[PDB]
Amino acid sequence: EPEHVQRLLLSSREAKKSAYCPYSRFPVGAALLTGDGRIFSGCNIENACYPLGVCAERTAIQKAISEGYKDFRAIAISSDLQEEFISPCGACRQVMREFGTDWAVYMTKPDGTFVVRTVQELLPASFGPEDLQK
Amino acid sequence: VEPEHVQRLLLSSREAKKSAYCPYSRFPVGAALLTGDGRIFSGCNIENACYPLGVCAERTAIQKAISEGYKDFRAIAISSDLQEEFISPCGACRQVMREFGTDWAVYMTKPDGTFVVRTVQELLPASFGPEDLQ
Amino acid sequence: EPEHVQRLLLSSREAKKSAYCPYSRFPVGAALLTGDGRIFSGCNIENACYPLGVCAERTAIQKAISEGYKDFRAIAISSDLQEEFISPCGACRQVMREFGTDWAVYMTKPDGTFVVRTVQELLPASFGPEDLQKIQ
Amino acid sequence: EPEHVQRLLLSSREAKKSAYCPYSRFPVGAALLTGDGRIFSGCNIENACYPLGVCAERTAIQKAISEGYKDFRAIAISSDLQEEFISPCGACRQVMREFGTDWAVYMTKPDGTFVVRTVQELLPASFGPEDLQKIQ
Ligand SMILES: O=C1N[C@H](O)CCN1[C@@H]1O[C@H](CO)[C@@H](O)[C@H]1O
Ligand SMILES: O=C1N[C@H](O)CCN1[C@@H]1O[C@H](CO)[C@@H](O)[C@H]1O
Ligand SMILES: O=C1N[C@H](O)CCN1[C@@H]1O[C@H](CO)[C@@H](O)[C@H]1O
Ligand SMILES: O=C1N[C@H](O)CCN1[C@@H]1O[C@H](CO)[C@@H](O)[C@H]1O
Ligand SMILES: [Zn+2]
Ligand SMILES: [Zn+2]
Ligand SMILES: [Zn+2]
Ligand SMILES: [Zn+2]
Known part of the structure; x- marks a missing residue:
């Protein structure tokens, strides 16, 4: 929905401002849209020990889940x-x-252009929960 | 940390634990942190079918706080x-x-509300840190 | 199958025996084939703190790199x-x-059947060194 | 220094040469001594996506485990x-x-001086395998 898309894209851009990235100096923002229209945002948060950083997309997803939301429609980066x-x-x-796998990933540039792919398209033939089921 | 803030932290951490996404371990963890200005952010563990891609409660809470502009932490309860x-x-x-x-407090609890408190320094002595990369 | 595929399949199956996976009970092996024909094996190695585990493929890659090998042709799982x-x-x-991006991943079953995809196919529109302007 | 210490320190120093660290430009080497005397080397191996890097110590440990060794005496960094x-x-x-938790961690400088602490001392009141034991 065009209302939601624009809010989401702006939320992702705004989230970037909070990035903690003194090591890469490469800020990343993300914003996720839930089934009921709520938006959760996030940013990358680095660590002196590089492997202990976290990405923007995961900050956003982790925030949403912690607040009881697991139904996602789209994520913008x-x-x-x-x-x-x-x-x-x-x-x-x-x-x-x-x-x-069916939900949308908006991959943006600073000028506001973007391309969209589904999670499935970005991670074909994926490992997933099904591997551990039964 | 005032007994009132400690109780708020304990309740916040236990409440956050209810949202844990942990179908693999069936080991729920909650965490709550207290910022300098008295705001509380909470988190839970969020697992992945690929075990290495999970995140701990403490980090969900810290990452949430940072994403919202808070980097001054007084205490965290688990x-x-x-x-x-x-x-x-x-x-x-x-x-x-x-x-x-390194100077802030970590409250390691049991379900009955008893706890052990140690500083970050005490839990991670002679630590690697930002100074290694200066 | 070609000799190198036979090697990949056997080495990856053997590598699985070393898995440290008391938590998932889901053992994984990997065998990485370098340009000069050397194979590096790996397995998953879990941790009581689940996020601190490592996968078989990364164990194998990390082994190869630590020994000065960076030219990879194929990996079987x-x-x-x-x-x-x-x-x-x-x-x-x-x-x-x-x-x-231009190397082969062999995704196997125990019966020795497999599906092959390239890294490019498995990670389309990949994030990578170019994002940090490291290709110069 | 004892012979095994000399070996640990030299192997850890040598391991640093293999570091893949174009992002941090901070090379790290590690050498892990097993109970039976074998040394496994490791180095940090970074990724364009910073969180996907691995540390020297884990490279070494993961190599050892993958080859069937779980009895560790000491690690030098x-x-x-x-x-x-x-x-x-x-x-x-x-x-x-x-x-x-009872084994030794040698934390070095390039001049060959070091400080030694046990895993227990470096990670007090630790989370571990016991937290996940079925029967309590
Ligand atoms: O937030 C991100 N999202 C993308 O998925 C990958 C890249 N990042 C972040 O960018 C910095 C450089 O790797 C890192 O801080 C890293 O975590
Ligand atoms: O949240 C946690 N906090 C402590 O730091 C370690 C343990 N955990 C979580 O517990 C589950 C089992 O390792 C995992 O989901 C793991 O992430
Ligand atoms: O080695 C793996 N390779 C694939 O990339 C994903 C799955 N794994 C490993 O399988 C167990 C369950 O996620 C885990 O120990 C996990 O690390
Ligand atoms: O290998 C390491 N051992 C120590 O445990 C921490 C630091 N490192 C590595 O140093 C670089 C900067 O964080 C990173 O590549 C990082 O992984
Ligand atoms: Zn990422
Ligand atoms: Zn943790
Ligand atoms: Zn994996
Ligand atoms: Zn490390």
């Missing part, structure tokens, strides 16, 4: 990288996939 | 369903805590 | 799932991609 | 930092603890 749409890393894709 | 052990932060959580200072 | 091909998680795909 | 002994991060401490 923003960065300062001008030359390419910001794409989720594989770890973020796997966390997205834990909560379904 | 809750679990383990009756016989105080719930202790894993080393990754200790390292994320340490990114935001 | 093995599990105990008889009725599913074992697929790499997104984190493993991202680590694979750090070392290139 | 090396870096290019002259001003500070290189200390393991909390994640590495937690992985060390999965395999016991």
Whole structure:
């Protein structure tokens, strides 16, 4: 829905302002839209020990889940990288996939252009909960 | 930390634990942190079918706080369903805590409300940190 | 099958025996084939704190890199799932991609059947070194 | 220094040469001594996505486990930092603890000086395997 898309894209851009990224100096914002229209946002949060950082998409998803929301319709991602749409890393894709494959990922540039792909399209033939079921 | 803030933290952590996404371990964890200005942020563990892609309660709480512009932390309380052990932060959580200072308090609780309190410094002595990269 | 595929399949199946997986009871093996024909094995190694585990594919890659090998041709993955091909998680795909998009992932079943996809296919529109302007 | 200490320190220093760290430009080496005398080396291996990196200590431990070794006597860590002994991060401490608390961590400087602490001392009142035991 055009109302929700625009709010989501702006929320992702705004979330970027809170990024804690003194090591990469590469800020990332994300915003997730739930089934009932609520938006949760997040940013990357780095650690002196690089592996202990977290991505924007996961900050947003983790916030939503902690507040009792597991039904996601879309997630938008923003960065300062001008030359390419910001794409989720594989770890973020796997966390997205834990909560379904059919939902939309908006990969943006600072100028407001974007491309959309589903979680399924971004993580084909995925490992998932089904592997551990039965 | 005032007994009133401690009680608020204990209740917040236990309440947050109810939202835990942990179908793999069936080991729910909640956490609540207190900022300098008295705001409380809570979190829970959020697991993934690929075990390494989960996140701990403490980090969900810290990441939520940072995403909303708070990096000044006074205390964090942790809750679990383990009756016989105080719930202790894993080393990754200790390292994320340490990114935001060593002097603050960690309340490791039991379900009955008894707890052990230690500083981040005490839990992670001679720590790796931002100074290693200066 | 070609000799190198036979090698990948056997080494990956063997690697699974070393899995440290008391929590999931889901053992995974991986075998990584380098450009010069050397195979590096790996397995999942879990931790009481679930997020601190590592996957088989990353164990294998990390072993190869630590020994000075960065030219990877193929990696095979093995599990105990008889009725599913074992697929790499997104984190493993991202680590694979750090070392290139143009190499093969063999997703196997215990009966020795498999599906092959490239890293590029498994991680379309990949985040990577270009995002940090490291390709210069 | 005892012969096994000399070996640990030299192997850890040598392991640093293999570091894949184009993002931090902060190379780390580790050397893990098993009960039977075998040394496993490791180095940090970074990723364009910073969280997908791995530390030297875990590279070494994961290699050892993958080859069937779980009895660890000591681990030494090396870096290019002259001003500070290189200390393991909390994640590495937690992985060390999965395999016991009574063993030794040598935190070194490039000049060969070091401080030694046990895993227990570096990770007091630790979360561990017992937290997840079925019967309590
Ligand atoms: O937030 C992100 N989302 C994408 O999925 C990948 C990249 N990032 C973050 O960008 C910085 C550089 O890797 C890191 O801080 C990293 O976590
Ligand atoms: O939230 C946690 N806090 C402590 O730091 C460690 C343990 N956990 C969580 O407990 C489950 C079992 O490892 C996992 O889901 C794990 O993330
Ligand atoms: O080794 C793996 N490779 C694939 O990328 C994903 C699955 N795994 C491992 O399987 C167990 C369950 O998630 C875990 O121990 C997990 O790390
Ligand atoms: O290997 C390490 N051992 C210590 O436990 C912590 C630091 N590191 C590594 O140093 C770089 C900067 O955080 C990173 O590549 C990081 O993984
Ligand atoms: Zn990511
Ligand atoms: Zn933890
Ligand atoms: Zn994996
Ligand atoms: Zn480490």
